[PDB]
Assembly symmetry: D2
Homo-oligomer: 277 residues x 4
């Protein structure tokens, strides 16, 4: 009945936001879940970090749908710990079909020639190398199951075009597109699809925070979401200021399900027409 009935999905960054939304949506449609998140502070994070209670709440939501979920608190930069958590989760759930490499950060925001080395490096470590780590940890289990699979990497509008003062994020998200194409070419012969979703602004903590509001409305002292919306909406072709996590989850579900069985190598924007500008 469900669009991914009988499948198992591994989701990074599942404590909250889009990753929690992917976990719930795929569980609604029949999938059991391996959910990991760092659940702690991140250097120079421009907004509140996630907590262990966040990930436990994702787990309760999935359990409420009478689906199984394995959670682990792990940093995608630690490959050996990430591999260990994935291995244990697949040992419990019995298979791995879907990988959603969703964990990521937004930090800092300077001119690209002024970004500091460690701020550049943390961005590359999480948003590019951490994506590679995530796919690398899960893919041996998709291969050994021998049933094909579907892998979704979260890039960004910033993986195809640049906005000022985000250049380390831009470079990482472009590199995610290259990871999607490389994995797609290499895993295609095993009927494993690899695609990317490219969101515009999404109404998560990564956007709905004081730092982001102030960068978009420097004219203001205490800018709020109402003041940020008109600027953000000017980036879009549809008259909306941002999309929701459920919009990204619906794209991930399409890509994860048999309804896209022959779709691979695709950059799918969920961007309200940002990339038409």
């Amino acid at each position: 009945t469900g669009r991914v009935a009988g499948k198992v999905a591994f989701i990074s960054g599942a404590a909250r936001g889009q990753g929690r939304s992917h976990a719930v949506r795929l569980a609604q449609e029949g999938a059991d879940i391996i959910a990991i998140d760092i659940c702690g502070p991140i250097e120079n994070l421009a907004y509140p970090h996630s907590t262990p209670e966040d990930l436990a709440e994702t787990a309760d939501l999935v359990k409420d749908l009478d689906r199984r979920i394995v959670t682990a608190q792990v940093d995608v930069r630690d490959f050996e710990a990430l591999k260990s958590a994935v291995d244990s989760g697949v040992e419990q759930l019995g298979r791995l079909d879907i990988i959603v490499a969703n964990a990521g950060v937004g930090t800092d925001g300077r001119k690209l020639h002024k970004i500091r080395d460690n701020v550049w490096q943390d961005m590359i470590d999480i948003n590019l190398t951490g994506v590679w780590h995530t796919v690398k940890a899960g893919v041996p289990h998709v291969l050994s199951g021998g049933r094909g699979g579907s892998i979704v990497l979260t890039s960004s509008v910033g993986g195809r075009k640049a906005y000022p003062n985000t250049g380390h994020y831009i470079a990482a998200k472009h590199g995610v597109i290259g990871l999607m194409r490389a994995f797609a070419v290499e895993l295609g012969p095993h009927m494993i699809r690899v695609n990317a979703v490219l969101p515009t602004q999404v109404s998560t903590t990564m956007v709905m925070n004081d730092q982001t509001f102030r960068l978009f409305r420097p004219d203001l002292e205490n800018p709020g979401p109402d003041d940020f919306a008109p600027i953000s909406q000017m980036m879009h072709t549809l008259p909306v200021p941002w999309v929701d996590a459920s919009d990204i989850s619906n794209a991930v579900l399409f890509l994860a399900s048999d309804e896209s069985r022959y779709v691979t190598g695709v950059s799918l924007p969920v961007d309200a027409g940002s990339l038409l500008k």
Copy 2:
């Protein structure tokens, strides 16, 4: 509980193949249908043409789903007849929400500097100008309904890259991407999404014919589908020789439904990884 419950979809080329599949798939998900097709011969067509009986069979399939359907025999090259058919269908069904500009041909197959003027022109007339005519005829009804909507143009892998001896088709299908982007920019402010699907080989009459087998297997005497499949599969990253009409319809359904409410301006390949080459 259908994914396009309460909607009306206008579909060109609906007598058979992908267009028939789109009408049946959207009807399964709750939409009433306006279905048009030339139902008649086309100059230099490399395979059997459609019949009035084909479109009557599409109507029977949609009515078996307890949905309403208006059909019409009309050539997308004849804008006034097309507009009159769409106006009458909308008067009968009460609204228009979805347009799928699917009608098209494959003809001929020569070096681009050797294609005859009228063969080039018929291809541009049907596969590029006919698509514009189709959207132009439908969009006043979507606009006047005031509920937004979703428009899907059928391009091709050949809308993004070229294969030898199909250059008039390549040119037209690239133009269709242009139409998608222009319509998306102009109609976005009215919450009307415009996207394109880009199929690889699909198991329809346009591909499954003797002229195609020979354009792919000159070495053979009377090549059939089994001799064509290895060649067609070499164009793909996934090990399949072609996709099915239902694969295109699943992509069209995604783009037509509220699950893609903020997806616009997108070229969505359904191509088994062709564009990764």
Copy 3:
């Protein structure tokens, strides 16, 4: 000594503007020229048309460089007359190495679903089919010379993205990109390169006219180039309001010369960063 010494170049639209500039620039660098232009009125042209005296002035400029030039007044929509003029010019100059498909128009400017059929059709005939006609007329002579060659098609920023109210031009210029890729794939095995140049606004008659000024500054009564410049400059990443014909000619020269001997299939924007938006 010259960067295209000993070569012959066929240039459409050479009466004025970019095409005249290509003729002079290639002649400066050693090439003899076949120059054609309609040299007369065009339906619904939004600015002054070219004259026979324009083309004679291009000829004098080329002759002043002690280069040979053949001119003909011919419409690129008339393939038989265009082929006849090209055949005669190659019979005189002895070879054909370079083709620049530069002739084009800007007309009208309505919402895409309101553009009239004949206005759409004239746009397609000149800017898409006329480009095909141009390449088709010249390419048998490049092939028969057996020395390779280089073919440049003038597309536009509008061949990769859409601006409102130009959708027939957008569709045609996208189709030019498809022509470039199709010809590139088919002619590559004969060492014939095929590329496109994609200009932003260029300071020619096609942009520097009252209609264009008024469309960009509706707030004004008599808007001039000084009022148009700030709006046009907002489309660019570099702080300039437009590029010059010589900027396009320098790109065409690079592509025409042995310095790009292995460059083929490329869309080269000369766009002040428009496509970064």
Copy 4:
């Protein structure tokens, strides 16, 4: 009368190969040179590393052209040493106008989920982070000169599509496209252009080595260049097996000179039609 008369160009990886060719080609056209190279071994390098004598030979070639050159042995991974070298070169030559971020490696060659963590990281360090370091070190001098300038990043065909067993290289080279676009957007307002060149196989040490021949011809015992060439040529639309360093330098010269004064944000393939496939 040189095409970059009076300019200063800073070039990374200038000891040999394309970087040496860029220094010599820009010097031929009138530029003074700041040339840096590690001139030393690199972990897991699949071919001979460069030497201090290589870079001294680049200096001799540039001085034979009666141009000035400052050389330095520095690793692009070490930003402070890199910045110190560039600061000293600019103090000696008086200005900086052109930056060519050319230094890079090819290493290893495994399935992407089997590449070891440190092999991945060295590739990201050199081919992505090293490029950022190179532009970051040079651009304050271009900015403070107040004359605009031109920056060229060396990506690859692998910056736009993937080949099997090179996924860490693919990811890094895609990131380099991101860097080009971000730098172009941020530096455009200062009339500083930023573009990328995308080579196919080039006849340098990075390709002409025994490990590459075997990664292309497993069937052979000791494959040489003649057994590699047919395979490499099948990746191309033009019938050549590779391009030469001089072909890349001609593209770099175009992008560095005033003949491309309004070209920015462009990915310029020099690829014999690879990206047409």
